[PDB]
Design a protein around this ligand. Structure first.
Ligand SMILES: CCCCCCCCCCCCCCCCCC(=O)OC[C@H](COP(=O)([O-])OCC(O)COP(=O)([O-])OC[C@@H](COC(=O)CCCCCCCCCCCCCCCCC)OC(=O)CCCCCCCCCCCCCCCCC)OC(=O)CCCCCCCCCCCCCCCCC
Ligand SMILES: CCCCCCCCCCCCCCCCCC(=O)OC[C@H](COP(=O)([O-])OCC(O)COP(=O)([O-])OC[C@@H](COC(=O)CCCCCCCCCCCCCCCCC)OC(=O)CCCCCCCCCCCCCCCCC)OC(=O)CCCCCCCCCCCCCCCCC
Ligand SMILES: CCCCCCCCCCCCCCCCCC(=O)OC[C@H](COP(=O)([O-])OCC(O)COP(=O)([O-])OC[C@@H](COC(=O)CCCCCCCCCCCCCCCCC)OC(=O)CCCCCCCCCCCCCCCCC)OC(=O)CCCCCCCCCCCCCCCCC
Ligand SMILES: CCCCCCCCCCCCCCCCCC(=O)OC[C@H](COP(=O)([O-])OCC(O)COP(=O)([O-])OC[C@@H](COC(=O)CCCCCCCCCCCCCCCCC)OC(=O)CCCCCCCCCCCCCCCCC)OC(=O)CCCCCCCCCCCCCCCCC
Ligand SMILES: COC1=C(OC)C(=O)C(C/C=C(/C)CC/C=C(\C)CC/C=C(\C)CC/C=C(/C)CC/C=C(/C)CC/C=C(/C)CC/C=C(/C)CC/C=C(/C)CC/C=C(\C)CCC=C(C)C)=C(C)C1=O
Ligand SMILES: CCCCCCCCCCCCCCCCCC(=O)OC[C@H](COP(=O)([O-])OCC[N+](C)(C)C)OC(=O)CCCCCCCCCCCCCCCCC
Ligand SMILES: CCCCCCCCCCCCCCCCCC(=O)OC[C@H](COP(=O)([O-])OCC[N+](C)(C)C)OC(=O)CCCCCCCCCCCCCCCCC
Ligand SMILES: CCCCCCCCCCCCCCCCCC(=O)OC[C@H](COP(=O)([O-])OCC[N+](C)(C)C)OC(=O)CCCCCCCCCCCCCCCCC
Ligand code: SF4
Ligand code: FES
Lengths: 102, 42, 57, 279, 75, 217, 61, 58, 44, 198, 102
């Protein structure tokens, strides 16, 4: 370009140096490392239900052949129990405020 | 030998449908445009 | 349940009933607020006149 | 500094040159037209005063054989010798003369230009490849991609005869028949849209077909390694099964089918690496 | 290619922990317990609310400076 | 509901009340039409089946309950004057900004985004970047400001609070003009013998508690 | 400068593109957009499109 | 001092393979852009300010 | 969806090739987290 | 009593040795992968103890163990595992530096490519500017020096010439032989130019 | 926590009775109710001078109270039948239509 190319180089070098300092400054480097591994664990080892069962059926745990139905039962029971608790709370509130209405 | 392949398919389809339902609001329209072309009661 | 037309009849009629009760309340409160402000002003002026209360700011 | 003027020039450039989208200078001044019109692309990136410069030649069809290469040679021998073009075999076997023969990437020598005198015929370089000179693109990026696929026989184990031939049989010979006839003319690659957008990370139909030929070679025992080499990033995955790599092959090969089978093997290869590796 | 839409899960995430299946029963128990705590308080707030007007619910309005809010008729 | 535009107020004895009534009746048609449209939308949405309505209602139709509430409150207050806005700056500053963000008073040109993009244009003109990058880095901050400006529904709640406050203020100010004639005689004596700008409603409560704490009782 | 080379009306980017893009872009919006939208609009009006006129509007000063 | 090529689709004659493949591509991109555009339009028209008075200013 | 969307971005847009697949896989993680968060909160 | 110390030591030794067994496979796979995104096939195909390997290698090189709990064979195996993890960390640093240099060359190539595309109506310049030529010259010099430094490792030298030098060849193909071209590519036109049929 | 709180607690019987009486009033006291809403629409009548709307509000409330009394024996019988149907409901349109004709 022109004489401003020196300013361009200075600015880009300053940005590079700041990035380098921030990345591998001991505490920041350690916390970025731990954050990267935590992100890997979260994304790749999420609580799935479908997975490759390479082991023979004589080796697969019964905890794995029934985990789907355990999860479905727990979620459905939680939902129906929440609905029942909402109905019970509604009737309880109505009865209580009818008793205290007088 | 994927376990619960049907469940995985159903879960992915349900997630996609729910996301498209909430992100686009396709099933929850606004009928203010249709209000002028309507006959009122009372 | 009833038809939605009847449900909205009920809705508008109950809106009108609530508005009528609010009208009663507004009229009563406004006239009594006028009376209350007159009484309070008269009380303050009488108290200040008879040297019973000294008002500074 | 050099920015704003460049932007103004280029925005003014194409807009003032999209109207004149074919320059068409004439070689000479002619009045009576008993001759076919040839719009031959001309560009010599050696002198500063030169730009893509379609030249309209007029010449009698009868005086040269009904071949595109013969027409170009007639143009580049008598009328304008400055024209350049690669050609050695004259039989459609070396692949040197691959050019855009009237909106199609086919070998110039084994090709026939239209006989209708009224409609001009246009000859252009191979297309999405840098232009060294008139109709002479540089296929060096193509050639280099041929080096990556390791196109030589690779044996894991030797043979006990040590004095005889590799047993291949006639049936297994036919597997690589229809794959080894490619002349590396690079007419499918320059007309393959996946190669248009990723000339770097996409090997191309011809190169992937050569890789498939070496993979299905009965003697070759590095099938898995070759699959691994080609089943990396978008080396092969970029192919979209469009089918234009087969429509324009002068030798009648089927690069579309070759790449389809290669992708099928890759898809099986990913699955096979789990089923066949579990203990 | 030209056919990429499948409901089948990607094999990249289909891996499995070395000590059994993916941790789902534990995480679903944690989620259910969290749901009970979360949808146990909004239920409490929703059904135990009443609206009252008394003239004792009102208090003097004040500015951001703390003094009482009085606006003149003509400002 | 088809309120005639002409007001019946005197306009010579209650100028503020007449102006308020004129503004209320002038804009009544537009706000009534918008209220009718919103109510029809809500009714038809309630008329839906399963996940198309009657299940996600009114829990998920919260962006039009707010619109209906704002429309009714603004229908009551035909026009908001800048003099009355500044008073609410005592409670909440930037109330004019919230009203602009919610009420289509003017065109909210992205001044901040435009000047930030101009700042990028200055840097892109020093270490020259292509004008494509200049246009992109001009659009980006303007787009950011537009995203952070429009869709702000908390401004709608702030405007609801302001409209409730202004409605109450106008109602009280309307009563001031009606009874200004009646209280003229008492006002002179009260002002001349009680030198205090404190409100009578505030002074009297001080008297009430003062008698409650220190009285012969 | 930018000596563009472009076979107008005989090329994939040109008149064939103009003829091809609308007919393929407007496939799903016209084969799954119209039916879905009609179903969603008309599922509400099982008995009518009428607007239950709250706020009167039948009254005039 | 740079090598300029030709776009290779400005010069290639249209073919049924080009048409079919880009028709499928445009069908899918049109479906996805229609969905995303409907979402964006619902976002845009739901984030518009309420109507003002004739002479309202702040 | 994400795979082919990224492929479309990489094929046609030259400047999208500046992003290495390390950054793209980070966008993948962020997008998946955002989608999960969106689905969770829309029911809350 | 020392439950915390026992658990820390057993966790560290377990992870370190387990990832020491599955370390040469990861290094070999990273060798197969191109220099552009050497961590690919782990983000896409199989993350076969790659991120876990990096994380626990850094931990092992930056943690300490109590030799009281270890046996003699256990401590020898753990120390060998720690050495393998440290070698993996050095190998990862090497491949990351090579990958970053590859991306420097690819950035040069992409800057050239954006100036030739037909969509680039924004800025069409016939001649490359001065600073891009200087960057090309400097990067080619660094690439030549890198090849010279890998003279003791023929396989690594060949891999670098194949992968990193390919984009140098692409830059070669994108520029005419005018102006300062002979001087800019003088280091390139000695050996590696002929490797790419030039 | 977003649904509006209730002010007056209504039993099921009271709610159904108010529903049916409001429907009867809207089908009978429509003119007085419309006049009252006409008075209570302007700023004066709604906020500033509710004293004007006193007579119209009284007329409307008297009409509604007359509806709530339903002194007619046929009205009482039909209303009781509709209330029984509604309470069994925890449909009824035919019963409502039979009642409203009285
Ligand atoms: C809780 C269950 C933990 C468990 O089973 O760990 C063993 C198990 C190790 O499995 P493996 O097959 O032996 O080794 C493969 C792992 O990738 C190898 O991973 P690892 O062994 O390095 O992981 C050790 C694991 C802890 O594991 C142990 O301490 C093992 C012994 C437990 C007793 O660490 C954590 O769980 C802590 C990080 C959690 C991050 C959560 C971020 C949320 C945002 O850990 C996991 O499977 C990780 C699950 C992470 C779930 C995150 C969910 C986010 C939503
Ligand atoms: C007449 C009233 C116009 C204003 C209505 C405002 C209320 C509203 O819901 O607007 C969104 C509304 C979309 O919701 P919708 O009424 O269910 O869509 C009807 C059709 O499905 C049509 O839906 P659409 O997705 O075709 O929306 C039309 C347009 C967005 O609308 C416009 O550009 C405005 C066109 C009219 C001016 O969006 C697109 O074309 C999407 C693809 C292009 C990228 C953006 O768009 C329109 O009313 C525009 C027509
Ligand atoms: C419906 C049809 C079917 C679906 C179509 C789906 C795509 C629709 C269009 C998307 C447009 C946005 C986009 O991503 O554009 C990328 C696309 C970049 O293309 P490219 O792969 O870099 O190649 C173009 C040149 O060869 C090289 O261009 P350059 O060297 O001048 O620099 C390119 C650079 C310059 O940045 C821009 O031009 C900003 C564009 C957004 C404003 O663009 C970017 O870095 C793109 C960043 C986008 C961020 C999100 C906005 O943007 C443009 O081409 C912008 C053209 C208009 C602006 C300049 C006009 C002259 C101003 C004086
Ligand atoms: C059309 C108009 C439309 C307009 C729409 C507008 C809509 C509304 C606005 C929306 C705005 C947000 C959208 C963008 C979100 C970006 C999120 C983000 O930062 O992603 C990280 C992402 C990192 O890149 P990556 O893809 O993860 O690459 C990782 C590869 O392994 C390696 O990749 P590589 O090969 O490229 O390696 C280079 C890489 C390497 O750089 C790094 O690795 C640096 C760290 C980056 C984040 C961690 C990435 C690690 C790998 C992934 C795992 C993440 C796990 C944790 C996730 C949480 O990057 C650099 O070296 C670049 C220079 C970085 C300088 C600053 C670095 C240190 C930051 C401070 C750290 C302090 C210690 C830790 C925290 C302690 C407690 C406070 O991008 C950036 O960092 C670049 C952009 C931002 C640079 C400055 C960062 C400041 C932090 C906030 C930035 C937010 C955006 C700007 C706001 C400005 C406000 C004034
Ligand atoms: C496997 O698959 C395949 C691929 O993949 C891998 C491939 O690669 C290929 C290779 C072949 C190809 C063709 C690929 C190339 C791809 C492209 C070129 C993509 C781009 C082309 C399309 C998307 C198809 C073209 C069709 C459309 C609809 C695109 C858009 C076209 C237009 C003409 C634009 C729309 C028209 C209008 C009018 C929009 C106007 C918008 C505005 C904002 C203008 C507003 C107007 C006003 C009046 C208001 C403003 C006025 C002002 C401001 C006043 C004026 C003042 C000023 C200062 C301006 C193949 C064959 C393939 O098989
Ligand atoms: C450069 C831009 C210059 C003009 C800026 C707007 C000027 C103006 O005041 O316009 C008012 C006008 C009209 O605004 P309005 O809200 O007053 O109009 C409503 C008018 N009635 C009620 C009569 C219908 O235009 C706009 O407001 C348009 C911009 C709205 C905000 C768009 C935000 C982005 C939407 C897409 C989001 C996608 C995801 C997030 C991306 C980030
Ligand atoms: C026909 C009946 C239709 C009822 C529609 C309103 C449902 C209200 C309850 C949901 C709620 O508020 O949840 C609170 C909260 C949050 O509600 P939300 O997130 O759905 O609504 C928005 C809430 N805020 C304002 C916080 C954003 O919890 C849940 O929604 C989680 C599940 C709770 C389930 C409670 C009962 C659901 C009843 C409907 C189930 C499906 C229809 C079938 C019903 C039985 C028919 C015989
Ligand atoms: C002259 C330049 C014209 C085109 C200017 C750019 C327009 C599009 C900008 C956004 C592109 C977004 C997608 C993208 O990245 O595409 C890039 C791609 C890149 O194509 P490419 O061939 O340059 O690819 C280069 C790839 N490398 C460098 C890696 C080898 O596509 C295009 O650039 C397409 C360009 C043409 C698009 C249509 C332009 C029409 C202009 C008006 C014509 C009017 C007359 C029509 C005919 C009339 C006949 C009677
Ligand atoms: S496959 Fe056919 S068109 Fe392609 S390079 Fe070989 S001979 Fe030429
Ligand atoms: S000259 Fe040999 S292919 Fe034509």
């Amino acid at each position: 370009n022109h004489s401003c190319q020196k300013v361009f180089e200075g600015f880009v070098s300053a940005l590079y140096d700041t990035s380098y300092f921030f990345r591998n400054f001991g505490p920041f480097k350690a916390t970025i490392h731990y954050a990267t591994y935590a992100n890997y664990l979260a994304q790749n080892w999420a609580p799935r239900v479908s997975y490759i069962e390479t082991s023979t059926p004589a080796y697969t745990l019964a905890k794995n052949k029934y985990a789907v139905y355990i999860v479905y039962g727990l979620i459905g029971g939680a939902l129906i129990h929440n609905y029942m608790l909402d109905n019970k709370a509604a009737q309880k509130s109505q009865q209580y405020y009818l008793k205290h209405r007088d | 030998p994927i376990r619960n392949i049907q469940f995985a398919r159903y879960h992915y389809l349900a997630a996609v449908t729910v996301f498209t339902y909430f992100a686009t609001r396709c099933c929850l329209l606004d009928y203010k445009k249709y209000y002028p072309l309507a006959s009122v009661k009372k | 349940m009833f038809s939605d037309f009847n449900m909205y009849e009920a809705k508008v009629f109950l809106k009108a009933v609530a508005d009528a009760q609010n009208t009663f309340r507004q009229t009563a409160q406004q006239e009594n607020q006028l009376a209350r402000y007159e009484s309070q002003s008269q009380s303050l002026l009488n108290g200040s006149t008879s040297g019973a209360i000294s008002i500074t700011g | 500094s050099i920015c704003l003027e460049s932007i103004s020039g280029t925005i003014k450039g194409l807009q003032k040159a999209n109207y004149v989208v074919e320059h068409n200078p004439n070689l000479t001044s002619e009045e009576k037209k008993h001759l076919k019109q040839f719009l031959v692309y001309r560009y010599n990136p050696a002198d500063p005063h030169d730009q893509p410069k379609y030249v309209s030649y007029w010449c009698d069809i009868k005086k040269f054989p009904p071949m595109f290469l013969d027409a170009i040679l007639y143009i580049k021998n008598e009328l304008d010798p400055t024209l350049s073009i690669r050609r050695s075999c004259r039989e459609g076997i070396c692949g040197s003369c691959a050019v855009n023969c009237d909106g199609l990437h086919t070998l110039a020598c084994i090709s026939g230009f239209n006989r209708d005198l009224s409609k001009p015929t246009i000859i252009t370089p191979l297309g999405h490849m840098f232009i060294l000179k008139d109709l002479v693109v540089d296929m060096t990026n193509f050639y280099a991609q041929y080096k990556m696929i390791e196109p030589y026989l690779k044996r894991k184990t030797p043979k006990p005869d040590a004095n005889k031939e590799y047993p291949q049989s006639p049936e297994q010979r036919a597997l690589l028949d229809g794959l080894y006839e490619c002349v590396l003319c690079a007419a499918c690659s320059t007309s393959c849209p996946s190669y248009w957008w990723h000339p770097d990370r996409y090997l191309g139909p011809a190169i992937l077909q050569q890789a498939y030929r070496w993979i299905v070679d009965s003697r070759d025992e590095y099938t898995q390694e070759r699959i691994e080499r080609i089943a990396e990033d978008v080396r092969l995955d970029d192919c979209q099964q469009i089918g234009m790599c087969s429509f324009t092959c002068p030798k009648g090969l089927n690069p579309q089918l070759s790449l389809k089978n290669l992708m099928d093997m890759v898809k099986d290869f990913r699955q096979k690496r789990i089923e066949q590796e579990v203990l | 290619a030209r056919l990429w839409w499948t409901l089948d899960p990607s094999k990249y995430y289909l891996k499995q922990i070395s000590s059994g299946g993916r941790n789902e029963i534990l995480f679903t128990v944690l989620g259910v317990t969290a749901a009970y705590w979360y949808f146990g308080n909004k239920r409490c707030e929703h059904y135990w609310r009443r609206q009252i007007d008394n003239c004792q619910s009102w208090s003097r309005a004040q500015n951001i400076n703390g003094n009482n809010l009085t606006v003149k008729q003509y400002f | 509901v088809r309120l005639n535009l002409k007001s019946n107020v005197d306009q010579n004895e209650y100028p503020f009340l007449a102006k308020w009534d004129k503004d209320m009746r002038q804009n009544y048609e537009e706000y009534q039409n918008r209220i009718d449209a919103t109510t029809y939308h809500l009714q038809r949405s309630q008329r839906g089946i399963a996940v198309f309505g009657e299940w996600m209602y009114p829990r998920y139709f919260q962006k039009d309950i707010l619109e209906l509430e704002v429309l009714r409150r603004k229908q009551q207050l035909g026009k908001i004057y800048p003099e009355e806005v500044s008073s609410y700056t005592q409670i909440n500053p930037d109330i004019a900004n919230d009203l602009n963000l919610t009420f289509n008073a003017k065109l909210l040109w992205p001044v901040r985004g435009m000047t930030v993009g101009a700042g990028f244009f200055a840097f892109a003109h020093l270490f020259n970047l292509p004008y494509s990058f200049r246009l992109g880095l001009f659009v980006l901050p303007t787009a950011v400001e537009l995203a952070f400006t429009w869709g702000n529904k908390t401004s709608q709640f702030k405007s609801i609070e302001f409209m409730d406050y202004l409605l109450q203020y106008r109602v009280s100010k309307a009563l001031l003009e009606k009874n200004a004639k009646h209280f003229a005689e008492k006002k002179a004596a009260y002002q001349k013998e009680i030198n205090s700008s404190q409100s009578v409603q505030d002074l009297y409560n001080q008297l009430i508690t003062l008698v409650s704490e220190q009285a012969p009782s | 400068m930018r000596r563009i080379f472009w076979n107008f009306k005989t090329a994939f980017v040109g008149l064939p593109m103009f003829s091809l893009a609308p007919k393929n872009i407007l496939v799903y919006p016209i084969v799954v957009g119209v039916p879905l939208y009609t179903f969603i609009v008309l599922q509400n009006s099982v008995r009518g499109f009428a607007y239950f006129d709250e706020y009167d509007s039948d009254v005039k000063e | 001092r740079t090598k300029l090529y030709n776009a290779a689709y400005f010069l290639l004659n249209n073919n049924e393979s080009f048409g079919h493949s880009f028709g499928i591509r445009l069908k899918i991109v049109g479906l996805n852009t229609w969905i995303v555009g409907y979402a964006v339009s619902r976002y845009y028209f739901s984030s518009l300010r309420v109507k003002a008075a004739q002479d309202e200013r702040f | 969806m994400f795979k082919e969307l990224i492929h479309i971005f990489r094929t046609y847009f030259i400047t999208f090739r500046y992003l290495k697949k390390s950054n793209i896989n980070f966008l993948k993680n962020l997008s998946y987290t955002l989608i999960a968060y969106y689905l969770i909160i829309n029911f809350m | 009593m020392s439950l915390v110390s026992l658990f820390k030591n057993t966790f560290l030794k377990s992870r370190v040795i387990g990832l020491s067994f599955q370390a040469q496979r990861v290094m070999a796979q990273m060798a197969k992968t191109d220099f552009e995104n050497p961590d690919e096939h782990f983000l896409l195909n199989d993350a076969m103890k790659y991120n876990e390997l990096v994380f626990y290698g850094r931990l092992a090189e930056n943690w300490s163990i109590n030799p009281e709990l270890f046996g003699k064979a256990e401590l020898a195996k753990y120390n060998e595992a720690k050495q393998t993890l440290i070698d993996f960390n050095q190998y990862h640093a090497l491949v990351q530096n090579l990958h970053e240099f590859y991306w420097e060359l690819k950035t040069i190539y992409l800057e050239l490519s954006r100036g030739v595309a037909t969509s680039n109506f924004h800025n069409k310049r016939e001649v490359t500017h001065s600073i891009i030529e200087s960057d090309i010259k400097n990067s080619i010099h660094k690439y030549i020096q890198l090849i010279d430094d890998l003279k003791d490792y023929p396989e690594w030298q060949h891999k670098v010439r194949e992968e990193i030098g390919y984009y140098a060849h692409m830059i070669y193909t994108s520029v005419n032989h005018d102006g300062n071209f002979p001087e800019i590519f003088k280091e390139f036109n000695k050996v590696d130019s002929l490797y790419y049929f030039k | 926590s977003i649904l509006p709180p209730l002010q007056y607690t209504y039993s099921n019987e009271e709610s159904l009775e108010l529903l049916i009486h409001s429907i009867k009033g809207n089908k009978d006291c429509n003119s007085e109710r419309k006049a009252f809403n006409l008075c209570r629409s302007t700023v004066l009548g709604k906020h500033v001078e509710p004293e004007k709307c006193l007579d119209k509000a009284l007329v409307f409330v008297n009409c509604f109270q007359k509806v709530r009394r339903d002194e007619s024996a046929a009205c009482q019988s039909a209303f009781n039948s509709t209330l029984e149907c509604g309470k069994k409901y925890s449909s009824c349109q035919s019963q409502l239509d039979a009642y409203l004709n009285c």
